[PDB]
Structure 1
Amino acid sequence: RLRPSDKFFELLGYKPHHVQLAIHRSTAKRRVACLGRQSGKSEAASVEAVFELFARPGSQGWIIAPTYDQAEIIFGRVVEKVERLAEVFPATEVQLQRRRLRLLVHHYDRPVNAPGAKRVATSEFRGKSADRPDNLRGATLDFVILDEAAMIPFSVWSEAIEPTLSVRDGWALIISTPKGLNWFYEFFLMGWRGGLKEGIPNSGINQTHPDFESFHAASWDVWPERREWYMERRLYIPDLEFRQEYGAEFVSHSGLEH
């Protein structure tokens, strides 16, 4: 499995945090990241999509979020970084179809300017919405990113998204702040090898699966210098919302409301 290099990071002006670097070095076909706000979820996801588009000519993938408005965040970051990386790859051509949320990177057999230049493959990236499942129509994909995955219904993943990955044995990066003990939590446990940890119920006794790898960090784990700035938010955000969005804590919703 191909993975991004230090040089690729440098060309993007990207300096990953420890947790981001872990996600990028993982070759697991199911990566599940439960990280707090500002931990780097969206940036890391966008870097993964850019990596596929340029390093693997003809690669196709989707970013799927609960809504199209949400999908535009990562989709837009990918467009920006693709525009940036294309500057030092003369044999590539970017084509954006903005209203469709469709981004193409054409790969040529020589600098696109040069005489006789022929197209050898076209990589593709689309933004998709779990609340418009009618636009999730029988695709064949190298990769998918599920953004705010804990808010995506499980059936959308199992029926509409996961089967797009079979033919190319593609990967999925499933990232979210947690929303209780739902499918995103169960998928998280399947990849969690870090042992007993506060904020992850049953993390001492979970069954893991070899194609899964899981990553976890509170906002203040990534930015210790911002710890007290985050803690101020406790005062005007409900306890459950704070623990999820900043603590990246898995907590039973009904259990807590007891």
Structure 2
Amino acid sequence: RLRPSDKFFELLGYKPHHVQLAIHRSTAKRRVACLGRQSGKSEAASVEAVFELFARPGSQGWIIAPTYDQAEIIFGRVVEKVERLAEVFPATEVQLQRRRLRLLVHHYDRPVNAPGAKRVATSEFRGKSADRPDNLRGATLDFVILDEAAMIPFSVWSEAIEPTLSVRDGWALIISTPKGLNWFYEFFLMGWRGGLKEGIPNSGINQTHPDFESFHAASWDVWPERREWYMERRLYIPDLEFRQEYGAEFV
């Protein structure tokens, strides 16, 4: 049900831009964001995780990226936010295992500093890596974040993530700069209701699934004052790399 509110953002120190805000307001179980670099993907994803850990005690979630080093980015941001925020929820206590990328938020039946405090629930967030399929062994997930999803093999989604989500009817936030016409393109299109758009083949004539909602932004959509700087980089950046990483185009 509940999405993080303006009050929750204010507690966090978070001031979302327009694309971020659209993602947070979406209630879709499959949110797919095709965004250029510097889009605010990481921060937005991290706020989603923070909200679940406190607002749904006992919730479990993963952030998955192509590598552990990539996964550490969103994980690290969730850790900072959770450790700080916990201060204003006296009935919580945070436990961190940095090496195992495991974050626990223990929920109690009274303030943690009170005598007799009993643990009632534990929310859990882990960082996972697509290049380490061996550590992708089950959990019952309420939510999942896929970072740089277009670089993650579809099998990771279809075999190791989607099944453990459909159980608790959990949600997925699937984020990436595009890597051509692969599974991330397909999932994007399933949620795309913004009509015909250059860079997106079959936009405007595509069908959509009701559980899907998709978002699109070039770097210069988020940062208009950087548009000229982005364009002038084409002098030394190959065209395809430019169109994908900044244009967020499916080529």
The alignment's TM-score, normalised by the length of structure 1, stands at 0.96
CA drift of 1:226 comes to 1.4
In structure 2, the partner of 1:93 is 93
CA drift of 1:237 comes to 1.6
Cα distance per residue 1:148-182 (max 9 Å; x no partner): 00000001100001111122100000000000011
Partners of 1:8 and 1:32 lie apart in 2 by 23
Cα distance per residue 1:16-72 (max 9 Å; x no partner): 011110100111000000001111101100000001001110000000000111100
State the SS of the aligned residue for 1:127: strand
Cα distance per residue 1:113-147 (max 9 Å; x no partner): 01121111000000000111111112110000000
Partners of 1:37 and 1:190 lie apart in 2 by 23
CA drift of 1:232 comes to 2.6
Cα distance per residue 1:74-126 (max 9 Å; x no partner): 00010011112111111110100011000000011111001121111000000
Q: Which moved more, 1:180-189 or 1:236-245?
A: 236-245
Count residues with an aligned counterpart: 251
> Is there any run of 5+ residues in structure 1 with no aligned partner, and where?
252-258
The alignment's TM-score, normalised by the length of structure 2, stands at 0.98
Partners of 1:231 and 1:190 lie apart in 2 by 30
Identity %: 100
Partners of 1:236 and 1:46 lie apart in 2 by 33
Partners of 2:15 and 2:243 lie apart in 1 by 27
CA drift of 1:10 comes to 0.4
State the SS of the aligned residue for 1:49: helix
State the SS of the aligned residue for 1:115: coil
Partners of 1:149 and 1:80 lie apart in 2 by 23
CA drift of 1:225 comes to 1.3
Partners of 2:166 and 2:157 lie apart in 1 by 13
State the SS of the aligned residue for 1:111: coil
- Divergent runs of 4+, >4 A: none
> Is there any run of 5+ residues in structure 2 with no aligned partner, and where?
none
State the SS of the aligned residue for 1:87: helix
CA drift of 1:233 comes to 2.1
CA drift of 1:238 comes to 1.2
Partners of 2:230 and 2:106 lie apart in 1 by 43
CA drift of 1:250 comes to 0.9
Q: In the TM superposition, what are the counterparts of 1:4-153 in structure 2 within 5 Å?
A: 4-153=4-153
Partners of 1:235 and 1:84 lie apart in 2 by 43
CA drift of 1:197 comes to 1.1
Partners of 1:166 and 1:204 lie apart in 2 by 29
Partners of 1:79 and 1:174 lie apart in 2 by 20
Partners of 1:234 and 1:157 lie apart in 2 by 34
CA drift of 1:15 comes to 0.6
Partners of 1:110 and 1:230 lie apart in 2 by 52
In structure 1, the partner of 2:195 is 195
Partners of 2:38 and 2:244 lie apart in 1 by 13
In structure 1, the partner of 2:160 is 160
